[model samples]
Target: TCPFYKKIPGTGFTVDAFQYGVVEGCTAYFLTHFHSDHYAGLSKHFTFPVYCSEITGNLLKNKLHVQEQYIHPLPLDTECIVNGVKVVLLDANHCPGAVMILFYLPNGTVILHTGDFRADPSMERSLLADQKVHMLYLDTTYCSPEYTFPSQQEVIRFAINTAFEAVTLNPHALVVCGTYSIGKEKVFLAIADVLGSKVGMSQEKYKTLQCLNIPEINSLITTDMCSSLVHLLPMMQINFKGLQSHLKKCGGKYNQILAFRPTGWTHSNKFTRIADVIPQTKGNISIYGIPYSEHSSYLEMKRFVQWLKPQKIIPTVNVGTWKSRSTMEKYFREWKLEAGY
Candidate 1:
């Protein structure tokens, strides 16, 4: 069954509690990441012990002001015992410090909760080796045949080249890229290194990037719109209207504006927006969608499940009310039949 909050069958641990659907009673809590949807209702009001990666723990204390004592840091690739349950943290590859949680219960059943992760080879060697998973809680956000996203490297290459092409065509064009608070910094950093231009962000985003302390991303951060050729904006600030407001600070000096939004949803055939001059307006702005996502595509999920072959698959997000569980089974069965494995 696709319950709102997932517990490990017999364990008292709850995963990613939401404000509206808080688990009634649980001895401990596990946070897969610090994304707003996953981290909702987690605040000073939460009294139980909270478990997550070191980076997420720090963000909890600093950004959410969660009490230091209540937060427990789960280092990546390391196993720790929490209240008699064996737990190991594996890299989720979705964003910095995001992880998938593996639980070894007292009943000898292995349970895995993948909290929004993209596929990586390391998972097979580290997590799925020689073990039978009894229950698999999957991050099936893009669990459909249509969502065939390109690899991260390919998408990043495309985005960088597209940005360069835009600037080359319109020498004075302002390049704007969109990203979430904790993910997709890699795209902007690569652009900065290749173009030899520093990235600009709001003060909050700047601090978040600084905390990462990545050697390749040691470039200067600025809020000045005119100082950088490429501007890194939050996902919410990437639309045509929001960008027009920022373009004014350039004093109409920019000849054009080209925007890049990296996401997997572009793979959906119905989404027809494309890269070109903005309609009904002067040739001032353009937007392009790059197929980059942190979640696994349907094919990736199929491969992952076939390898593990868990007894039961519990989807993290309930796509439809009561049919969500059946949907997971149907998706899995169809893929298995097609692959003939």
Candidate 2:
């Protein structure tokens, strides 16, 4: 005899790939965001339906340029039924297209899956006041005590200051900085704003800024279409190998060449100064370590878990990654739920 509402082949849970198709369970799976880790399983199966926030759906359909027929997009704070389960999409505040899933059981039991959240007080205030989360599948990426970080705003300021100061130092070199097309443009855009009407931020950066919904910042670039105060160019537009060639071709061209990217590329806060005749061979390149991250920190994850007060908690993000599942259990005693199929 088979014991399951519908058991899977590998896992004991009723959820299986066949009955639910590629959804992991049921006719659909509510995707909280468009991040690679959160939706990595999508590549395995494609027959089932996918539910996500409007922002996420747009990024895939518009930004990523993918068209999936079974994609069900819902605006934030909207509730819908999926295979007899009530789910609501709440803002996660991690990225431009982030969302948290709230699953409401028919018997009044609620399981909240916080899809890579942070300790944004505004987000907490909004979600807590309206929703009731009896169980929280929290994110524990930064549970260790050593990783202390600065605020996002502070990081943005450092990036801007570094760029502006460099510009004042050398007013005849093109500032080349590395930034992601989708993820890490927010800080650059803010710096571009402070550069004033003489220069302009990049087109790609402006678009991401608009998604943040801050009208004041959006107005900065919109008011001056022809302004050259600051230029926001993508990372791909800048070059590392052919950098020296460019300076030689154009004698003392732009004001500065600052690169913003991962620590692996370069970690210097100051680079070389250009000469009036030869453009000084190269320019300055600095990498500031800002504390801006999309994932949850240690304390933030604990705070979320404390808030949920679940009778039983289980780790689902990464199954056999490390001791997260066992460590959390010891500090906070609770029954661990079995892994999802």
Candidate 3:
């Protein structure tokens, strides 16, 4: 079964993904973001009306070629009714156009689907305060103690400084930063703004960034290997083989290549060799896995659960393993009990 397709029992709305057994009965589809995994099985042939941010809708049309007739744009902070159910979309703060959906059901039950988000102060004040969440489809992507990382802003600052310091140490070295295709634009923008240089990215990435409308930072096509500019590569494209190919193209004109990977996984021993606040050199290249992530850490998840005190939590990722689901449920139950609510 797919990971993210869930239909509200009372309301006929589905959250994320238009997969089998889930897309047929739903009256409308609520997409959290344009991430492929969350939005798998959806295409231009979708029959049901889809709801998401205007930016997301546009991206779907432009990137995925989804038909505009079936796309419904739901602006942020506004309530819209679909099939008699009142729905509100709030900023998820996970990505550029990501949103958490609030479904006000006909039966007076309030359901919150956190379509991949980090809990922030603004979200708590605007959406969570004075509202009771009956059911919470939480994003437990990094729901573990080992993922206690700092805020994204702090990590971005570190990344920007690290890139500059690397250039200072090796003037001829090429700086490469790993980021998701849509997310982590801030880090690259900050690096470009501070360094007073344009970034080099693939044509596909440039198109996505163009939709963002941030003109302060500029980018160009990454073709030549001699330019002294930061190269932004997709997180998955920054592997050893990919870097080695790029190195071959550079032809030793650059002294070295420094790469920075920003992710919460850096907090665990799994990435100890590559994790460091200060860049660590290995071979002809240096890599640093910064403690940066969009998902809420263990402490943040516990606090969110305690505040919401949802009647039930549907573990989206660990559903395949009963033990994993039990552990997640126990973690939430213990936290809520400790909070005395």
Candidate 4:
């Protein structure tokens, strides 16, 4: 009756596979974006045609090295009939290649698969404003009311200020802002530009960022380690171990390192507003946990759901495991109760 998994019910399509391998009952494969979680199982061994946005398709080919022939890049907001369903790639406002996918079935059903999105005003105007969504596969990254984070703009501004103040006081200190690949690079980008510090990155990290093809990004970054204090690294290297390695890599040039961990990963919660976001200091490294998230806040999610008023809401993230799935369902029930069923 409903889409039980990434395999859309009766649609012969799989949107973001579980990555255990191939799904048994799927014909066409739809990739919403470039995140590893969503695109984990993708490989060159598979022979399925993959549909995604231009950037998403490009990454699958150029970055992931999937076969170019198997990928189909669709322009945003344009209608393209892949197989039988009418598909549209709308900006998800999440990551660089992320998109909110819409599919119109022959039976007159409209399904919206929001891979992982931060809802905004422009989405309504750009994404199916007048159309009614029959079913919505939502990215319930944060499904509870407690998860209403501050706006991205506010977080970015605060983050920029934080970096400025840090470098202002400790002139010899280096700013180590860390985030995942293709996610929340904006935070570091802004911080680097505002601080007038060139970005430091390894050849591999810079190569990945280059694939995103932000025009101004080329001039601002440097592979030379000694040039820039503000360096971009994967979340794996931003922690205590990596921080230590990096600081030591500098040969004791920079006395202190202030690492900016810009993510929505939080408490009752501590960072309810932009101002509540604060840094934790340990040893020579001070870490700032910014509430910058790509996914929609609870407020935005509610606003979007109430506005779209989809008939059924399917949870995408945090839906596995007993207690987690059950807890998310409770929040979903509460959301449905207030949003006119």
Candidate 1: RMSD to truth: 3.3
Best by the lDDT measure: 4
Clashes of 2: 25
TM-score: which candidate is best?
4
| C-alpha lDDT score of every prediction, in listed order | 0.76, 0.53, 0.75, 0.80
Candidate 4, residues 276-320, lDDT tens digits: the string is 655677698887777778888788887888778788888888876
Ordered from best to worst lDDT, the candidate numbers read: 4, 1, 3, 2
> Model 4: clashing residue pairs?
none
lDDT of 3 at 331: 84
CA-only RMSD, every prediction: 3.3, 8.2, 2.9, 2.6
Model 3 quality (TM-score): 0.89
Ranking by TM-score: 4, 3, 1, 2
Model 3, residue 265: C-alpha shift (Å): 1.6
Model 3, 127-177: lDDT tens digits are 567679888888988776766776777777777777787777777778788
Q: Which ten residues in a row have the lowest lDDT in candidate 3?
A: 216-225
What lDDT is obtained when candidate 3 is compared to the true structure? 0.75
Residue-wise C-alpha lDDT for candidate 1, range 54-73, written one tens digit per residue: 88888888778899999999
* Residue 165 error, candidate 1, Å: 2.5
